[PDB]
């Protein structure tokens, strides 16, 4: 249920998502499959 809510919660620890797509990872997420922009890739930094 809280998909984008964790996705953005876990991405803030790397916070690259904060600039790359910013709120898109919390308000949109999932539909934006482009390179799966979320914590899973931002964490590898």
- Domain boundary assignment for the chain: 1-45
Contacts of 40 (CB under 8 A, 6+ apart): none
CATH class, domain 1-45, is mainly alpha
Distances from the Cα of 27 to the Cα of 5, 7, 45, angstroms: 8, 11, 23
Q: Please check whether residue 16 is in contact with residue 42, taking contact to mean a CB–CB distance below 8 angstroms.
A: yes
Integer angstrom CA distances of residue 11 from 1, 3, 5: 17, 12, 10
Question: DSSP per residue over 1-45, as a string?
Answer: --HHHHHHHHHHTT-GGGTTTTTIIIII-SS--GGG-SHHHHT--
């Amino acid at each position: 249920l809280q998909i984008d809510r964790l996705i953005d919660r876990i991405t803030e620890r790397a916070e690259d998502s904060g600039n790359e797509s910013e709120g898109d990872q919390e308000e949109l997420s999932a539909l934006v499959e482009r390179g799966h922009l979320a914590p899973w890739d931002v964490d590898d930094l």
